[PDB]
Amino acid sequence: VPFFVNRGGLPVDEATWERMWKHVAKIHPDGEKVAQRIRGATDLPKIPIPSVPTFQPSTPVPERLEAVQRYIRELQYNHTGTQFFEIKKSRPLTGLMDLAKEMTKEALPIKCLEAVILGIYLTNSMPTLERFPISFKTYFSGNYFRHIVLGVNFAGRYGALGMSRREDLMYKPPAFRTLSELVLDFEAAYGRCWHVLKKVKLGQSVSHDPHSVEQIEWKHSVLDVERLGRDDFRKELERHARDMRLKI
Amino acid sequence: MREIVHIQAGQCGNQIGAKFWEVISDEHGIDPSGNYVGDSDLQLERISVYYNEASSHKYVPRAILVDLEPGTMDSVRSGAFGHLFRPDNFIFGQSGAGNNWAKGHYTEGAELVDSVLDVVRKECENCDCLQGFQLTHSLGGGTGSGMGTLLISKVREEYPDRIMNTFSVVPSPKVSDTVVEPYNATLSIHQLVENTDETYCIDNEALYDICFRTLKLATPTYGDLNHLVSATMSGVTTSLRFPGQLNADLRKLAVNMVPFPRLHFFMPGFAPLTARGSQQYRALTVPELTQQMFDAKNMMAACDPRHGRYLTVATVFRGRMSMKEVDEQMLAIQSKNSSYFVEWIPNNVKVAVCDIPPRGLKMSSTFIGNSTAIQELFKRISEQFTAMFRRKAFLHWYTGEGMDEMEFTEAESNMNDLVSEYQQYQDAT
Amino acid sequence: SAQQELKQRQRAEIYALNRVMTELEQQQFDE
Amino acid sequence: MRECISIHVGQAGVQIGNACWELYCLEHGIQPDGQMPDSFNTFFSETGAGKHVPRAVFVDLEPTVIDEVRTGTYRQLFHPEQLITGKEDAANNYARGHYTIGKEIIDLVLDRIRKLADQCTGLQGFLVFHSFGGGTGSGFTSLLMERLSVDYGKKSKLEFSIYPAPQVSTAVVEPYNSILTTHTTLEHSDCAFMVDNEAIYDICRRNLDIERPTYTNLNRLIGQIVSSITASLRFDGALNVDLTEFQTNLVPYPRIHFPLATYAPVISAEKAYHEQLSVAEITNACFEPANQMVKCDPRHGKYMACCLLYRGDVVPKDVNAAIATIKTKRTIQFVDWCPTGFKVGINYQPPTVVPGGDLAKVQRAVCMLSNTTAIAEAWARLDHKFDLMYAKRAFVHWYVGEGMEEGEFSEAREDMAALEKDYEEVGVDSV
Amino acid sequence: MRECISIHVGQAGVQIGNACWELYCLEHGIQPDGQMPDSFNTFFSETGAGKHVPRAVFVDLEPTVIDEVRTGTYRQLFHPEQLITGKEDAANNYARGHYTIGKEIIDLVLDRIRKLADQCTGLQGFLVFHSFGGGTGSGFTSLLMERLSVDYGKKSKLEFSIYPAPQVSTAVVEPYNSILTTHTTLEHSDCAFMVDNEAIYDICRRNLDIERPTYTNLNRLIGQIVSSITASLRFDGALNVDLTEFQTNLVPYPRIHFPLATYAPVISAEKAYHEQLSVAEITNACFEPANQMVKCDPRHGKYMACCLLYRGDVVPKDVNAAIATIKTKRTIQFVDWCPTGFKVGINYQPPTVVPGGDLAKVQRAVCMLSNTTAIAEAWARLDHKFDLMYAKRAFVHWYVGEGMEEGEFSEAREDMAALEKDYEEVGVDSV
Ligand SMILES: Nc1nc2c(ncn2[C@@H]2O[C@H](COP(=O)(O)CP(=O)(O)OP(=O)(O)O)[C@@H](O)[C@H]2O)c(=O)[nH]1
Ligand SMILES: Nc1nc2c(ncn2[C@@H]2O[C@H](COP(=O)(O)OP(=O)(O)OP(=O)(O)O)[C@@H](O)[C@H]2O)c(=O)[nH]1
Ligand SMILES: Nc1nc2c(ncn2[C@@H]2O[C@H](COP(=O)(O)OP(=O)(O)OP(=O)(O)O)[C@@H](O)[C@H]2O)c(=O)[nH]1
């Protein structure tokens, strides 16, 4: 459960790597019995390194975004509860986008957070596409978890990208009418997994220049779920859907 | 002062060289007797790139004229500039090889080429800092393709640091005046890859195409095609002789163009090219003439540059330019046909300007493209040569001399590896 | 620092690891 | 005392110095003959006959550039034993300026410095002038400034390099000859300025209202900045901004010596009357991303330590008052770990007019030198653009055949990326 | 202090300011060269050279209108950095003013305001000038008034909009681009005056005894109103009618900021001697329905709160005496819930004469700004006129193809009908 702040993903060291198999003695049911079939196995399944699809110029925006998700769905999303990278919020962009240059080369099991990063990195060749990050504050029984998506905008219509543990928080096709009902698909996704919502974090639109040094603004607006009106969720977030066009 | 001895091999190279020095003797204001009658002293301060001095105010061009065919010496000896050249430099044999390559390289050329290197070493001794050797010849012929490559492999043995230029007029499939043109062409290129470090594969089809379409002359009577390749021959070395805002030597071009040591085959191009009396007065304007300079019609090699992405491009301007308007236009060209350039060479269009135009214009700009669509120039010849080599026709005129039969199968593989090497980057990234 | 050996033997080690961890995170809630 | 010599390398080095020393002759009344018809001694070691030899050495390996200066105007001003000149251009090549040809003419240049560094009682520092666009400007300067810091350890050395633009480009091998330069200019240099050449076209088109500026319209705007940086050494005011003072008033670490220059005002003669050019307007114009002298947006990054250098009819009352607007109630965020602000470099002498007719006269100026962390996006191009070329091993054989080992590019990129990681390191304080 | 800039937009907006700034130079002695041969600083930020620069931002997306100003007379008065100019005219298309082309040139107009709003110690407010007749006057202003309300929240912003006339018309999409702009000016604006274009012909026909008036005989009368509204900020008297302690004498509710202007006297030169132009007839002329600036009859509706803004040689004795006849002994019925009456804006400065020869000089003048509910009859002739066109869905495909959602007309008509219900809501007190 507590993800680490380690460095040197490929190749791995001899300190962070040895605690991957001690942590599974608590949450995974076997713990040490799987070490004879994972660490104690010379033979292993050879999953290759898939490449990012270099799109031809006769491929428009929504055909590319499925081909973007056709990369990240085959990226083997991680469940081990330990981060493999050096991803931070307060991080410069070229220190982060060049870390995404070490995502196609490394291609380790990744979590939901850097999928938002790689969703930005695999979308810089679409200047008509405007993106923005949205993080959720999900309420379990007394606890607060985070789920961050990447909301997109092409031809006026909305949509969102991202990865999670289940299918209902993944890629949304870019055909939604407004922005408020787009979050409602995530809100209906939280009703199935027995999740309550607390806050919706709106951020500034990420600038379309991959070689630049600025921090990514994730907290341009905060929408408290249980402590604000439902009409304000369809009006202030609708004006914020136009306010992202107001900066531009 | 960087120096370049200039070797007019062959006969067509001698035909374009008699119009090459006619450009330069006008460009420095040198009379046909050899004196100086120029007005501005900025053209006199550096003439030693292309000239010498006699014991007066009388200059003599650093030129070596080589042709097995005689009599065409007597054209330029009795032409408009017969009293300009050094008469000791006129080297010519007796017979004249009749469109043969083995004759002219093995048998006939070896009995003459030692007289040349006693002159090219005589001219290398009066030069302070030698830059390179230009030589202008016709590929596919007898002399300029068989004596020329013998002359290069003897020069590059003695000077492995000096640069080399080769303005080889390649053969064309539509305008061919020789039945053994696809034999002398494919034998020359194997001895042209390994020795020269930048050629200029001009063609004689696109020169005929320019004088009908672009220049719109009635009759291209060979005083134009031998002149139009002379303007883009002075245009490469117009920064060595004139103070520019941003100037480029021949070493600067060959360090900016070839990404690998085998890819030196450049299709040159010159602009502006008006009509004879219409566009030079009425229609054409002369800022941003790169739209003319990048067109498929205004090339020298008869190849379609849209059929293959450029590797590197050098545009040597000449006029009194304005370096924003040079470079802002140069970005707009690179962003327009952005699929027509190699990905892994970003910002490849080399600029270079000067301060003195040709006499009779205001601005002018050559263009030296190192395209990959030059593989279409070699896919025609290696189609025609492989057709005749099946029947093995016209082979006793080469195997009759001291040339083996396996030399052709070796020379075709050395060409087809080059077309395999040039196709290696058209599709990869 | 030799590569293609440590970065593929321990790369497929996690690939054999998360196959049960993917199944574990979807079996704790099926009620 | 307080002498300061300026060396010039490359085609960019002389063409700036042809118009840089054009400006100093107007800033001291010195004729083109060197014969003044007070204190010019920071730039002119005069002779007893009445002449004034400028303390500069022009270096180029190709003779076609200096012979313009050696024969046109200002041909009697310079000293003919100091215009060092090679024969081969070696151009667009780092190794041919650092190993092959530049190795030959170093012993004539470095000897000529010691024939000028032995006339200085107080030597403030060296002022190199080159471009990163290949040839001698990066090949020979990497050999020169490595050779100077051996013989002159405790001496400052400025660097007015012309960093290559992202889009506007001249050399094809332009990214290769800049990754090989920063391994030199990280160690041996000090406060290496890096102006760009595309960013002046975005200044000389809107701020200065002329169309299609030549290289004589950017090498005068680069001349005024080296004037007003060294305007403290030769005039009066409330300055105390000599080159050893503002050096460690600027750099926070030995690796963050890459500020950007910015001049203001640059308004043309037509709109010189339609705007009152007072000190609140002059500083507020000096912080625009459309007014910097490099292709970077400083709003994206954060300033570490600026250094304003005013000159002319200002007073420190409203200079310090107009600063507090820009200091506090703006969104140009400074870094957290230094709240002291920035140097103020008030000088008395107003800037002059070069008579070529480019920008009209004013009463105030500023050459702000911000050590922002927005230079990490200037190297973000060339860390990628060179790596895009080196992946296919293009153009390497023109360096590995000249003396350069093939592993040098794998060393230079490895160093220059760790610098960019180090530049983005000091941008954050709180967790 | 008390500076007040004025932005202009449209074919109407520059053509008014071409003749409005013609008037202010006469009201301060300013030459056409901007060089006065006291206190003008509410309209002129002067320079130290003796010049004067007007504080106005002439914008238009089409170049053919400002180039009349930029080439003829008054070409040296303005500043060339502020005459913002696009390339496409954005031909009568609100979506081409609010989404397509106006989005490109917003960041230059908004940048020029902060280069003028930072020279203002006391900023009274903004004075926009546009027409509701399509194009940039309605499309680009809706992208501008929405823009200024973010950066300048607590700041007044007047609006001298031209309303589309009922019968006289120029555009075909005049009713389309006026329902779309009132969704902007209902919220972001403040005291949006809406003069008409037909009603000034019926002043230039009978009150002014000229025939065939051009747009120069009609923009002089719209320049005199903006003169005597801002005659409190730059002259003396018994005023206290600055634009924030006057606009809270206007609005009873935040949605009723739509007064009408009315100027008096407008008597021609040949009729100037045959009438003693004194304050009894001068005040009674303002309430004639044949003397309003909008084609509407205020005898139909009821006034809420006027604002009589005098100027010239008056005294407050008979001002308060001539008011009481109009207040009580008349049938111009006020609304019941405000019995205090209206403001009084006595100023000392008499109005001047533009030398084009339109109206001779007088000694008194009014600009009464009545917040009557007779503007509801100026919208029922637009609510019906728009819905007659939208019922057949004509011309909608020139907006939905330009980046505008088709449901916005069903929102703008829904909004502006609820405003008309709200404007008629406060018309009755007792049952
Ligand atoms: N560019 C030009 N090429 C020419 C011209 N005249 C002929 N030729 C070209 O040159 C070719 C023939 O010239 P060559 O010098 O090769 C004939 P050869 O080598 O055998 O020497 P000689 O027999 O002494 O003439 C011919 O196929 C054409 O392609 C010309 O005027 N200009
Ligand atoms: N800003 C500016 N840059 C210049 C100027 N002149 C040349 N440059 C730059 O110089 C770069 C090319 O490098 P060079 O200065 O020619 O260095 P070099 O190769 O050693 O010089 P040569 O050997 O004589 O060719 C180009 O990228 C230009 O940007 C100038 O006048 N102003
Ligand atoms: N009162 C008045 N109205 C005018 C005058 N000139 C033009 N107009 C009005 O202004 C409108 C012209 O369009 P603009 O407001 O400038 O906006 P636009 O559609 O973009 O026009 P352009 O900028 O020229 O393309 C017309 O509907 C006229 O009614 C004038 O002099 N006085």
mmCIF file of C-alpha atoms in Angstrom, chain B residues 138-347:
data_model
loop_
_atom_site.group_PDB
_atom_site.id
_atom_site.type_symbol
_atom_site.label_atom_id
_atom_site.label_comp_id
_atom_site.label_asym_id
_atom_site.label_seq_id
_atom_site.Cartn_x
_atom_site.Cartn_y
_atom_site.Cartn_z
ATOM 1 C CA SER B 138 30.662 14.056 -68.780
ATOM 2 C CA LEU B 139 29.678 10.709 -67.354
ATOM 3 C CA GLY B 140 28.769 7.999 -69.832
ATOM 4 C CA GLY B 141 31.233 9.251 -72.435
ATOM 5 C CA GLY B 142 34.653 7.976 -73.322
ATOM 6 C CA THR B 143 37.187 10.490 -72.067
ATOM 7 C CA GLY B 144 35.499 12.214 -69.132
ATOM 8 C CA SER B 145 34.290 8.943 -67.642
ATOM 9 C CA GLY B 146 37.432 6.877 -68.174
ATOM 10 C CA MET B 147 40.280 9.357 -68.066
ATOM 11 C CA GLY B 148 38.527 11.301 -65.315
ATOM 12 C CA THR B 149 38.224 8.504 -62.772
ATOM 13 C CA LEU B 150 41.805 7.497 -63.507
ATOM 14 C CA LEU B 151 42.750 11.102 -62.795
ATOM 15 C CA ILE B 152 40.804 11.278 -59.527
ATOM 16 C CA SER B 153 42.207 8.058 -58.052
ATOM 17 C CA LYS B 154 45.707 9.337 -58.815
ATOM 18 C CA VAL B 155 45.016 12.746 -57.276
ATOM 19 C CA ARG B 156 43.323 11.381 -54.142
ATOM 20 C CA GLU B 157 46.329 9.112 -53.654
ATOM 21 C CA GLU B 158 48.560 12.179 -53.394
ATOM 22 C CA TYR B 159 46.184 14.577 -51.579
ATOM 23 C CA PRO B 160 43.968 12.710 -49.108
ATOM 24 C CA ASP B 161 43.044 15.891 -47.214
ATOM 25 C CA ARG B 162 42.071 18.244 -50.033
ATOM 26 C CA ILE B 163 38.415 18.308 -51.020
ATOM 27 C CA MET B 164 37.100 17.124 -54.392
ATOM 28 C CA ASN B 165 34.337 18.354 -56.677
ATOM 29 C CA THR B 166 32.879 16.568 -59.680
ATOM 30 C CA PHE B 167 30.309 18.166 -61.965
ATOM 31 C CA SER B 168 29.465 14.944 -63.740
ATOM 32 C CA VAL B 169 26.872 15.249 -66.499
ATOM 33 C CA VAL B 170 25.043 11.934 -66.037
ATOM 34 C CA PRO B 171 23.205 10.226 -68.915
ATOM 35 C CA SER B 172 19.445 10.441 -69.233
ATOM 36 C CA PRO B 173 17.085 7.797 -70.638
ATOM 37 C CA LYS B 174 15.119 10.166 -72.863
ATOM 38 C CA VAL B 175 17.984 12.148 -74.387
ATOM 39 C CA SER B 176 20.710 9.585 -75.083
ATOM 40 C CA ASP B 177 23.246 10.112 -77.861
ATOM 41 C CA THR B 178 25.389 7.036 -77.203
ATOM 42 C CA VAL B 179 24.618 3.331 -77.386
ATOM 43 C CA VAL B 180 27.217 2.485 -74.725
ATOM 44 C CA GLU B 181 26.066 5.192 -72.340
ATOM 45 C CA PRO B 182 24.747 2.704 -69.704
ATOM 46 C CA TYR B 183 28.152 0.981 -69.773
ATOM 47 C CA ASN B 184 30.455 3.949 -69.235
ATOM 48 C CA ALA B 185 28.136 5.382 -66.590
ATOM 49 C CA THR B 186 28.005 2.363 -64.294
ATOM 50 C CA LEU B 187 31.750 1.777 -64.557
ATOM 51 C CA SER B 188 32.559 5.314 -63.448
ATOM 52 C CA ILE B 189 30.436 5.561 -60.305
ATOM 53 C CA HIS B 190 32.286 2.774 -58.465
ATOM 54 C CA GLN B 191 35.488 4.789 -58.893
ATOM 55 C CA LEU B 192 33.583 7.976 -58.036
ATOM 56 C CA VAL B 193 32.090 6.988 -54.677
ATOM 57 C CA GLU B 194 35.335 6.027 -52.968
ATOM 58 C CA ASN B 195 37.440 9.035 -53.980
ATOM 59 C CA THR B 196 35.463 12.256 -54.407
ATOM 60 C CA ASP B 197 33.772 13.673 -51.331
ATOM 61 C CA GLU B 198 31.100 15.770 -53.059
ATOM 62 C CA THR B 199 29.893 15.474 -56.639
ATOM 63 C CA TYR B 200 27.220 17.446 -58.489
ATOM 64 C CA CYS B 201 25.212 15.026 -60.618
ATOM 65 C CA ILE B 202 23.743 17.430 -63.122
ATOM 66 C CA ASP B 203 21.779 16.026 -66.041
ATOM 67 C CA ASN B 204 21.249 16.987 -69.661
ATOM 68 C CA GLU B 205 17.544 16.183 -69.758
ATOM 69 C CA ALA B 206 16.431 18.714 -67.157
ATOM 70 C CA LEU B 207 18.654 21.332 -68.772
ATOM 71 C CA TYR B 208 16.685 20.740 -71.960
ATOM 72 C CA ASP B 209 13.527 20.858 -69.853
ATOM 73 C CA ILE B 210 14.425 24.235 -68.348
ATOM 74 C CA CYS B 211 15.113 26.044 -71.627
ATOM 75 C CA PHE B 212 11.662 25.102 -72.951
ATOM 76 C CA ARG B 213 9.466 25.405 -69.860
ATOM 77 C CA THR B 214 11.084 27.849 -67.437
ATOM 78 C CA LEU B 215 13.547 29.848 -69.527
ATOM 79 C CA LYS B 216 11.271 29.485 -72.609
ATOM 80 C CA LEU B 217 14.026 29.710 -75.183
ATOM 81 C CA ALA B 218 13.264 28.583 -78.708
ATOM 82 C CA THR B 219 16.400 26.584 -79.541
ATOM 83 C CA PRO B 220 18.736 25.389 -76.763
ATOM 84 C CA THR B 221 21.886 25.473 -78.896
ATOM 85 C CA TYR B 222 24.415 24.204 -76.271
ATOM 86 C CA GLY B 223 25.642 27.705 -75.481
ATOM 87 C CA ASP B 224 22.968 27.768 -72.801
ATOM 88 C CA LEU B 225 23.152 24.367 -71.106
ATOM 89 C CA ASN B 226 26.916 24.785 -70.950
ATOM 90 C CA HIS B 227 26.216 28.250 -69.546
ATOM 91 C CA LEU B 228 23.489 27.267 -67.098
ATOM 92 C CA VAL B 229 25.762 24.723 -65.416
ATOM 93 C CA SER B 230 28.450 27.398 -65.264
ATOM 94 C CA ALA B 231 26.267 29.737 -63.220
ATOM 95 C CA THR B 232 25.710 27.080 -60.570
ATOM 96 C CA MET B 233 29.424 26.268 -60.693
ATOM 97 C CA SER B 234 30.436 29.805 -59.803
ATOM 98 C CA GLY B 235 27.600 29.858 -57.291
ATOM 99 C CA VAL B 236 29.105 27.196 -55.050
ATOM 100 C CA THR B 237 32.377 29.099 -54.634
ATOM 101 C CA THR B 238 30.942 32.608 -54.562
ATOM 102 C CA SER B 239 31.611 32.846 -50.832
ATOM 103 C CA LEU B 240 35.311 32.041 -51.186
ATOM 104 C CA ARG B 241 35.835 35.129 -53.339
ATOM 105 C CA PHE B 242 33.509 37.730 -51.833
ATOM 106 C CA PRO B 243 32.911 39.125 -48.335
ATOM 107 C CA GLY B 244 29.495 37.962 -47.195
ATOM 108 C CA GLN B 245 27.374 38.496 -44.125
ATOM 109 C CA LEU B 246 27.435 34.724 -43.636
ATOM 110 C CA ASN B 247 29.787 32.874 -45.969
ATOM 111 C CA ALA B 248 30.450 29.195 -46.571
ATOM 112 C CA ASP B 249 33.533 27.482 -47.962
ATOM 113 C CA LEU B 250 33.652 24.125 -49.718
ATOM 114 C CA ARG B 251 34.746 22.426 -46.504
ATOM 115 C CA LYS B 252 31.726 23.983 -44.791
ATOM 116 C CA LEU B 253 29.403 22.494 -47.403
ATOM 117 C CA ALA B 254 30.827 18.978 -47.266
ATOM 118 C CA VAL B 255 30.636 19.041 -43.468
ATOM 119 C CA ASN B 256 26.992 20.153 -43.611
ATOM 120 C CA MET B 257 25.670 17.897 -46.371
ATOM 121 C CA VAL B 258 26.829 14.282 -46.130
ATOM 122 C CA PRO B 259 25.624 12.365 -43.049
ATOM 123 C CA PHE B 260 27.581 9.256 -44.079
ATOM 124 C CA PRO B 261 30.734 9.113 -46.224
ATOM 125 C CA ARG B 262 28.980 7.450 -49.196
ATOM 126 C CA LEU B 263 26.095 9.894 -49.704
ATOM 127 C CA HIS B 264 27.813 12.600 -51.771
ATOM 128 C CA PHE B 265 25.598 12.910 -54.839
ATOM 129 C CA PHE B 266 23.975 16.324 -54.992
ATOM 130 C CA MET B 267 21.346 17.664 -57.357
ATOM 131 C CA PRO B 268 22.125 21.367 -57.815
ATOM 132 C CA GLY B 269 19.675 24.083 -58.730
ATOM 133 C CA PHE B 270 19.907 27.759 -59.640
ATOM 134 C CA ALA B 271 17.367 30.571 -59.383
ATOM 135 C CA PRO B 272 16.161 33.129 -60.605
ATOM 136 C CA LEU B 273 15.538 31.864 -64.125
ATOM 137 C CA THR B 274 13.294 34.339 -65.924
ATOM 138 C CA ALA B 275 12.090 34.404 -69.488
ATOM 139 C CA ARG B 276 14.318 35.972 -72.117
ATOM 140 C CA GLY B 277 12.555 39.325 -72.148
ATOM 141 C CA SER B 278 9.306 38.979 -70.223
ATOM 142 C CA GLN B 279 9.770 37.893 -66.610
ATOM 143 C CA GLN B 280 13.112 39.672 -66.155
ATOM 144 C CA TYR B 281 11.289 42.989 -66.672
ATOM 145 C CA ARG B 282 7.596 42.527 -65.889
ATOM 146 C CA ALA B 283 6.432 39.604 -63.857
ATOM 147 C CA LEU B 284 9.141 38.208 -61.604
ATOM 148 C CA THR B 285 10.135 39.889 -58.360
ATOM 149 C CA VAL B 286 13.234 38.962 -56.415
ATOM 150 C CA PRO B 287 12.653 38.575 -52.737
ATOM 151 C CA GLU B 288 11.736 35.032 -51.574
ATOM 152 C CA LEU B 289 12.764 33.295 -54.793
ATOM 153 C CA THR B 290 13.114 29.994 -52.924
ATOM 154 C CA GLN B 291 9.673 29.048 -54.266
ATOM 155 C CA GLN B 292 11.341 28.842 -57.661
ATOM 156 C CA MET B 293 14.452 27.290 -56.145
ATOM 157 C CA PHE B 294 12.683 24.279 -54.615
ATOM 158 C CA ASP B 295 10.473 23.390 -57.584
ATOM 159 C CA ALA B 296 10.729 20.109 -59.445
ATOM 160 C CA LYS B 297 11.070 21.979 -62.743
ATOM 161 C CA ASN B 298 14.044 24.073 -61.616
ATOM 162 C CA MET B 299 16.458 21.232 -60.963
ATOM 163 C CA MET B 300 19.554 20.063 -62.776
ATOM 164 C CA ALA B 301 19.287 16.322 -62.194
ATOM 165 C CA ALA B 302 16.288 14.937 -64.085
ATOM 166 C CA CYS B 303 14.679 13.435 -60.993
ATOM 167 C CA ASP B 304 11.480 14.137 -59.095
ATOM 168 C CA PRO B 305 12.338 15.414 -55.595
ATOM 169 C CA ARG B 306 8.764 14.716 -54.493
ATOM 170 C CA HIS B 307 9.511 10.999 -54.914
ATOM 171 C CA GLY B 308 12.015 11.013 -52.054
ATOM 172 C CA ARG B 309 12.729 12.944 -48.884
ATOM 173 C CA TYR B 310 15.675 15.334 -48.778
ATOM 174 C CA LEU B 311 18.555 14.566 -46.454
ATOM 175 C CA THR B 312 20.306 17.953 -46.351
ATOM 176 C CA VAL B 313 19.914 21.148 -48.372
ATOM 177 C CA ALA B 314 22.379 24.009 -48.888
ATOM 178 C CA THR B 315 21.073 27.283 -50.328
ATOM 179 C CA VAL B 316 23.929 29.655 -51.165
ATOM 180 C CA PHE B 317 22.455 33.108 -51.725
ATOM 181 C CA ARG B 318 24.351 35.923 -53.406
ATOM 182 C CA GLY B 319 22.359 39.139 -53.404
ATOM 183 C CA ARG B 320 22.151 41.938 -50.885
ATOM 184 C CA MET B 321 19.793 39.998 -48.660
ATOM 185 C CA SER B 322 18.115 40.576 -45.299
ATOM 186 C CA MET B 323 18.812 37.689 -42.964
ATOM 187 C CA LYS B 324 15.373 37.591 -41.354
ATOM 188 C CA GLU B 325 13.709 37.357 -44.768
ATOM 189 C CA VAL B 326 16.182 34.633 -45.709
ATOM 190 C CA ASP B 327 15.557 32.605 -42.569
ATOM 191 C CA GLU B 328 11.846 33.235 -41.975
ATOM 192 C CA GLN B 329 11.206 32.099 -45.544
ATOM 193 C CA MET B 330 13.467 29.110 -44.944
ATOM 194 C CA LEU B 331 11.358 27.982 -41.999
ATOM 195 C CA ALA B 332 8.141 28.348 -43.999
ATOM 196 C CA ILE B 333 9.556 26.091 -46.714
ATOM 197 C CA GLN B 334 10.561 23.462 -44.160
ATOM 198 C CA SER B 335 7.125 23.563 -42.519
ATOM 199 C CA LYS B 336 5.177 23.418 -45.798
ATOM 200 C CA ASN B 337 6.352 20.071 -47.179
ATOM 201 C CA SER B 338 7.313 18.748 -43.757
ATOM 202 C CA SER B 339 6.982 15.155 -44.972
ATOM 203 C CA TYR B 340 9.582 15.798 -47.696
ATOM 204 C CA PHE B 341 12.501 15.947 -45.251
ATOM 205 C CA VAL B 342 14.292 13.389 -43.124
ATOM 206 C CA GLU B 343 13.031 13.320 -39.536
ATOM 207 C CA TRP B 344 16.362 12.659 -37.824
ATOM 208 C CA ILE B 345 18.020 15.704 -39.420
ATOM 209 C CA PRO B 346 16.112 18.649 -37.905
ATOM 210 C CA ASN B 347 16.588 22.177 -39.281
#
